[PDB]
Design a protein around this nucleic acid. Structure first.
Lengths: 64, 476, 59, 335, 128, 56, 238, 33
RNA sequence: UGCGAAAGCAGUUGAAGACAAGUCUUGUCGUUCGUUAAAAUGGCCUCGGGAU
């Protein structure tokens, strides 16, 4: 997951997620959380979605 | 998010005895006949060589006391159980008792016999009484208080008695081994002077030790046999030795994975470790320049670096040793809540691992073939790149100058079995990608010529191995 | 830098108070100061680990 | 010393009102003993202090040092009415029986108030009463015919005579409690004193002297002399069982203590004892009051309650495992 | 309830209806990087069989590791057997033994059967 | 004697429509931001964010 | 009576902070402990204490959101490349068995300008285009650099640069109209040159002046209105 | 399952099982506040 | 694509419609019917007042 800083065009990373990122959102009046949808494309027999709510402050999984 | 996985690149009893790395070699004026360890801290050991006894500091591994009063050759330096006294026997037949660390004063001097006194050992359970065995073939049992007549005079040996042992937990029992090949057990509680019985070794007995309260292990001739007092027959016997086994030592309850060890000298230059818990089977060995006459290992309660000592007839003494802002320190012992969120840094990565982590495929291959690079570690990076699917990718931007380091290793790695299959993959790709450049490069050609000769040589070996394999199947 | 180095300045007169601190006022190496939002309390921490409270009776 | 300056259970014993200081200002709060409320009545003046606090049958009347009595309604969280005496002398004590409200000033002047009419009915001063730190109006019928008053001795006064009736030899120190257990039997305790004297009103003889282990700060009587629980200054609660049945001096039978799991002792600052249940109250953190109900009849003689308090607590985040590895993250492969 | 996801295992608690763990049981490019473009044609090792002893203290896994394409050794599948142990209190299985190419080279382990309680106290298994 | 009953859950629900992008997530966070409501194909789970448990 | 007397500190008191409304005093130092005492003037008992392993405290502060009075937070930093936030809201201060601690350690590309989090301050910034108000954490950089972060999300909002070595800074507020205010960052050089930045306008300089006769400046502070020591509880009180 | 019941999995990832007084008003008001 | 073992053994790709480029010839498909049937320079965080 890449946060592009648009003022300076910089970017912050959160790598090694469980799956490829299908959807991204910033949730909160102050951007407290990031809600991501992960896909886990390794399993071709099915589409395996995992919903991950991260804490914006420290990018730690608040709820998977 | 998960932390990045790290790239994944003998017996425990052997690994422990491997640790006696530091080897110090000393010269003595004559053959070192006996070696003994002080039972108490600092557990200094005494070596009997020529006409003197020298005590070595455990930590310093250097002589700290020298007992040079003996006019003729000395034949023992055994300490008492508490370690204050040491007794020594002389070829003249005089047995002398000195205070350890005080060579000057002589506490007690006894004339056991006119013949040589080869063995002088303190009784382990009783401090007062001292045992002496002489070429007179009588193993007198002395008392320090009574220096004029032995308490008891064991007899019955028809040849030289050079071995004497006290069975632990049996103060009344005494074991003596003679060159007759007989090991005689005596009872000091009774009248004595006649063995309870005799155990036949069939070869001259050169040393007898009591491994446990019921088991005694005697080394004579080319083998050592363990005898059980309760059954009065040898349980086991090992004859791995080539020359005549001379000395043997036993240490129990030390910090090794193995509970107990039996050290045995050989006189072929070998001293080997035997495990009593696994039926006295070989587990370790050392080789020395010449025949070994004495062996010793530091006691169980060494309290410091452990020592293994070997004594050679040339006088050499071999030692192997196993070496053993005012609020910054608060730690919050009085506080309600203690929060610890620090994480230790990951162990240092190598250059090739950093390149793979950063997706530097070409540079990771370069790190593989660098001077002083372990062959196994070179094989991992080649396997990692293949697993990542980056074998052609690592080989695009290359010419003859930077291709030779890979081909040089392939020339040597084709010979190894583990790397043979990997070398075939990498060599197959480089030929498919650099066929044209090879035509215009003369140096690349000869690398392939010698590669073709070696790979042809490997084919013959593999064809050969199949034939022996067919042969082996026919036998079975 | 030194012990008891603390002064209170009246505003807008910009005149340092004379009666306090005194020679007997225990302040130590002043390293932290705080005023309560209301109530006129003054907290002064020092290099010894001691926080001392004073009340300004005017507030 | 305790952060709780004053405290008092309601007559039913289910709510505790306590006064504490925030910075320089006192705040009055009420908590439900049986089971948090963030609402306090704040005194806007640093000088103003609560001298007295008495439950009204949901109102609490607070004696002030300003010389006036504030009737405080807990629900609205505001003072409905303020009874102001003509003088400015601080109120030492107050007591209530229905509409009858009696108080005393530091000037030793008695006053009477009517809650229904909100009027100062009468005020008077009785000679031979130089100091007055306690006032208790005796329960005779449905009217007040006599008052128990004590400063260092104890005296009985009749309202209509406006004169003393009987005097009891009290403690050396100022009297701190003057509760009446039953008819012709009231107990008395003093500041920094370990002795409680039981006096007979009709006669005037010391029936008994109950002796506590340490200084007494509070006192609660159960039923009609059935039991008496006294909070000691050292933080332990003593219970006296049948104090009114050698005979002159009696000691406590049961003792109750609080200690944390780590080992620290937590003092008890107030307690309530109704029929067979005892309520204990202690402070956690700085000023938060915590409670516990127990059946003292079955409790052994020396009983120590054990409570869980934070002490060297390793901080566990719900989002991390023991090793700081995020719960969402997968476990890596290690040979 | 153990689900052998590709190259990993999901431990799922159907009483609570919530996943209790996700553990990688094989080597490969699992979470070292995100595969893009041609790297996305790579096949990680597949956990073909997963079984428990009757006692339940031991986990037996069988893996097939596939070679990359476009190589000489692009058709020599590797078959691996692994034995893991785990104390009941912890949640992570620990690899105790690894057997590479059991039953020979390129010979699949088509069946695994843990032993009954009678033999070895359930400390054995058959591979066929 | 025997009977069948569904016990465990199923996959989380998603707005599985090709055209809509970035609006696939249907799970909603409470106005107090104390719990996350997530629809499954066979139920709706309410997780408490603070304690990380399915409260309802 | 002394505040520490109930539970003493094992090192020097590096920072002190009174809670904006509640009667609590916060203490911090190189002991690595955050002790909170209930200041009544007479007893001063300890509400709670939080040891942070290997996190020396050079400064600490309470923070209350200017809009949501129920949001309560403590920020603490030291000579480290991270900062800790402790959410004290709801019942976390007293009743909770554990502490909700967050570590800020990401500078979003500006790690070179920032070496340590030890010197910092917290202010209120109003996003004028939406009228919403939140808190910001200001830091001191290497080369005149002031890095401003979001208080909750930790995102890097803006950076301000002065010439010379940045020695100290402070925050001043200017109300504009009903429900509006502007945050000014005041930063000073050791030489004595003072910059004033407009944090509501990307932190562009709005005023430059020099301290008359200043040399070897060490500190700068504003007083008489809302500040870190006298914070507001509503917009109208700015 | 090692109990009597059998657990079955259905391709919608569904696991089924086949097997055999003024005080009272004051308290309420205080709670509301 | 089907069966099979991993070895292999059999077989499979067509009709349109729309548009872009050249200038009538070619490509492409966020389009249909049927058949078991490479390449936008773009690489993965931080948490080291007093004595006198």
């Amino acid at each position: 997951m890449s946060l592009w800083q648009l003022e300076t065009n910089s970017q912050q990373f959160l790598p090694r997620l469980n799956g490829i990122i299908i959807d991204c959102q910033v949730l909160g009046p102050q951007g407290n959380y990031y809600s991501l949808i992960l896909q886990m494309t390794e399993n071709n027999s099915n589409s395996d979605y995992q919903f991950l709510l991260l804490n914006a402050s420290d990018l730690t999984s608040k709820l998977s | 998010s998960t932390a990045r996985p790290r790239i994944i690149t003998t017996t425990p009893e052997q690994r422990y005895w491997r640790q006696y790395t530091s080897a110090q070699l000393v010269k003595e004026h004559n053959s070192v006949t006996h070696i003994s360890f002080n039972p108490q801290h600092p557990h200094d050991f005494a070596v009997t060589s020529s006409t003197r006894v020298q005590i070595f500091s455990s930590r310093t591994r250097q002589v700290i006391k020298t007992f040079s009063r003996f006019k003729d050759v000395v034949y023992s330096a055994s300490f008492r159980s508490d370690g204050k006294l040491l007794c020594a026997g002389d070829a003249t037949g005089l047995v002398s008792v000195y205070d350890s660390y005080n060579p000057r004063t002589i506490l007690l001097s006894i004339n056991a016999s006119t013949h040589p006194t080869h063995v002088t050992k303190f009784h382990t359970q009783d401090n007062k009484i001292l045992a002496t065995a002489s070429d007179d073939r009588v193993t007198r049992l002395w008392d320090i208080s009574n220096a004029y007549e032995p308490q008891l005079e064991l007899t019955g040996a028809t040849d030289y008695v050079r071995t004497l042992s006290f069975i632990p937990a049996a103060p009344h029992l005494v074991a003596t081994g003679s060159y007759d090949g007989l090991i005689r057990l005596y009872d000091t509680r009774s009248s004595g002077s006649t063995p309870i019985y005799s155990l036949n070794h069939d070869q001259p007995v050169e040393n007898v030790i009591a491994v446990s309260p019921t088991q005694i292990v005697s080394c004579g001739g080319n083998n050592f046999k363990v005898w059980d007092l309760t059954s009065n027959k040898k349980l086991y016997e090992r004859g791995n030795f080539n020359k005549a086994v001379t000395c043997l030592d036993y240490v129990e309850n030390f910090d090794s994975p193995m509970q107990s060890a039996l050290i045995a000298s050989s006189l072929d230059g070998h001293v080997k470790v035997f495990d009593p818990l696994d039926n006295f089977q070989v587990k370790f060995g050392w080789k020395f320049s010449g025949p070994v006459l004495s062996c010793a290992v530091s006691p169980s309660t060494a309290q410091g670096n452990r020592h293994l000592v070997a004594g050679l007839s040339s006088g050499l003494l071999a030692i192997r040793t196993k070496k053993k802002m005012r609020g910054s320190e608060y730690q919050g012992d009085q506080e309600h809540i203690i929060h610890n969120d620090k994480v230790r840094s990951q162990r240092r990565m190598r250059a090739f691992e950093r390149n793979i982590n950063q997706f530097k495929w070409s540079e990771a291959l370069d790190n593989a073939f660098v001077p002083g690079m372990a062959k196994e570690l070179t094989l991992t990076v080649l396997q990692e790149l293949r697993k990542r699917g980056k074998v052609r990718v690592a080989l695009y931007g290359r010419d003859e100058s930077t291709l030779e380091p890979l081909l040089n290793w392939c020339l040597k790695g084709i010979e190894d079995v583990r790397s043979a299959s990997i070398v075939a993959d990498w060599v197959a790709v480089v030929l498919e990608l650099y066929g044209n450049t090879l035509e215009s490069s003369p140096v690349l050609q000869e690398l392939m010529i010698d590669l073709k000769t070696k790979v042809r040589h490997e084919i013959h070996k593999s064809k050969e191995a199949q034939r022996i394999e067919g042969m082996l199947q026919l036998l079975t | 830098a030194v012990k008891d180095a603390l002064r209170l300045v009246h505003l807008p007169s910009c005149s340092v108070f004379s009666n306090w601190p005194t020679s007997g006022t225990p302040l130590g190496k002043v390293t932290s100061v705080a005023f309560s939002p209301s109530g006129g309390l003054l907290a002064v921490g020092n290099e010894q680990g001691k926080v001392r409270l004073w009340k300004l009776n005017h507030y | 010393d305790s952060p709780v300056l004053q405290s008092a259970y309601d007559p039913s014993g289910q709510y505790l009102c306590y006064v504490t200081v925030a910075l320089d200002k006192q705040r009055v709060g009420v908590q439900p003993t049986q089971r948090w409320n963030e609402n306090f009545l704040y005194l806007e003046d640093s000088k103003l202090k609560v001298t007295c606090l008495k439950w009204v049958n949901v109102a609490i009347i607070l004696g002030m040092n300003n010389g006036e009595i504030w009737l405080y309604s807990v629900l609205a969280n505001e003072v409905t009415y303020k009874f102001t005496t003509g003088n400015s002398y601080e109120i030492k004590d107050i007591d209530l029986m229905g509409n009858q409200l009696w108080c005393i000033d530091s000037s030793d002047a008695f006053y009477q108030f009517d809650l229904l009419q909100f009027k100062l009915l009468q005020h008077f001063r009785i000679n031979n009463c130089v100091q007055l730190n306690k006032l208790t109006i005796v329960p005779a019928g449905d009217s007040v015919a006599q008052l128990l008053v004590a400063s260092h001795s104890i005296s009985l006064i009749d309202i209509e005579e406006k004169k003393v009736v009987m005097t009891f030899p009290g403690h050396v120190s100022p009297v701190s409690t003057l509760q009446v257990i039953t008819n012709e039997f009231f107990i008395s305790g003093a500041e920094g004193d370990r002795f409680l004297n039981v006096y007979d009103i009709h006669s005037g003889m010391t029936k008994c002297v109950l002796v506590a282990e340490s200084d007494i700060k509070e006192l609660s009587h159960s039923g009609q002399a059935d039991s008496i629980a006294v909070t000691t200054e050292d933080g332990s609660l003593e219970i006296f069982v049948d104090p009114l049945v050698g005979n002159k001096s009696k000691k406590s039978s049961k003792k109750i203590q609080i200690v944390s799991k780590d080992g620290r002792k937590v003092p008890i600052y107030n307690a309530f004892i109704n029929k067979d249940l005892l309520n204990v109250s202690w402070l956690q953190n700085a000023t938060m009051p915590y409670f516990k109900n127990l059946q003292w009849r079955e409790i052994p003689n020396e009983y120590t309650v054990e409570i869980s308090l934070n002490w060297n607590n390793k901080n566990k985040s719900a989002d991390r495992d023991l090793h700081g590895k995020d719960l969402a993250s997968a476990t890596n492969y290690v040979e | 309830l153990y689900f052998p996801h590709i190259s990993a295992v999901q431990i799922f608690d159907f009483y609570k209806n919530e996943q209790v763990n996700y553990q990688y049981l094989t080597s490969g490019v699992n979470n070292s990087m995100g595969k893009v473009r041609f790297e996305l044609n790579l096949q990680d090792p597949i956990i073909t069989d997963l079984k428990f002893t009757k006692d339940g203290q031991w986990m037996i896994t069988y893996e097939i590791e596939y070679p990359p394409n476009d190589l000489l050794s692009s058709k020599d599948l590797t078959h691996i057997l692994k034995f893991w142990t785990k104390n009941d209190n912890e949640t992570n299985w620990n690899l105790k033994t690894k057997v590479i190419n059991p039953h020979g080279i390129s010979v699949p382990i088509t069946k695994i059967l843990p032993s009954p309680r009678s033999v070895n106290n359930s400390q054995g298994c058959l591979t066929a | 004697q025997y009977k069948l009953s569904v016990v465990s859950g199923g996959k989380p629900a998603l707005n599985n429509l090709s055209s809509v992008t970035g609006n696939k997530n249907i799970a909603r966070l409470s106005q107090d931001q104390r719990n996350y409501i997530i629809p499954f194909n066979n139920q709706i789970k309410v997780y408490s964010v603070e304690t990380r448990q399915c409260v309802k | 009576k002394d505040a520490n007397a109930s539970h003493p500190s094992h090192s020097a008191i590096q920072s002190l902070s009174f809670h904006p409304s509640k009667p609590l005093l916060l203490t911090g130092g190189y002991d690595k402990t955050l002790r909170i005492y209930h200041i009544d003037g007479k007893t001063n008992h300890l509400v709670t204490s939080l040891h942070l392993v290997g996190s020396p405290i050079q400064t600490c502060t309470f923070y209350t959101s200017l809009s949501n009075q129920n949001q309560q937070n403590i920020f603490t930093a030291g000579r480290r490349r991270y900062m800790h936030s402790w959410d004290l809201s709801l019942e976390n201060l007293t009743h909770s068995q554990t502490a909700k601690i967050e570590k800020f350690s990401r500078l979003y590309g500006h790690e070179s300008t920032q070496r340590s989090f030890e010197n910092f301050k917290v202010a209120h910034l109003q996003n004028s285009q939406t009228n919403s108000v939140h808190g910001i954490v200001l830091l001191q950089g290497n080369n005149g650099w002031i890095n401003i972060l979001h208080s909750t999300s930790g995102l890097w909002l803006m950076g301000c640069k002065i010439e010379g070595v940045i020695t100290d800074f402070c925050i001043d507020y200017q109300p504009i109209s009903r429900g509006k205010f502007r945050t000014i960052l005041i930063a000073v050089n050791a030489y004595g040159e003072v910059w004033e930045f407009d944090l509501n306008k990307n932190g562009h300089v709005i005023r430059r002046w020099k301290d008359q006769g200043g040399v070897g400046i060490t500190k700068i502070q504003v007083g008489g209105g809302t500040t870190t020591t006298c914070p507001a509880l509503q917009i109208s009180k700015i | 399952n090692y109990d009597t019941d059998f657990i079955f999995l259905d391709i919608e990832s569904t696991l089924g099982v086949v097997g055999t007084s003024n005080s009272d008003i004051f308290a309420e008001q205080l709670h509301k506040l």
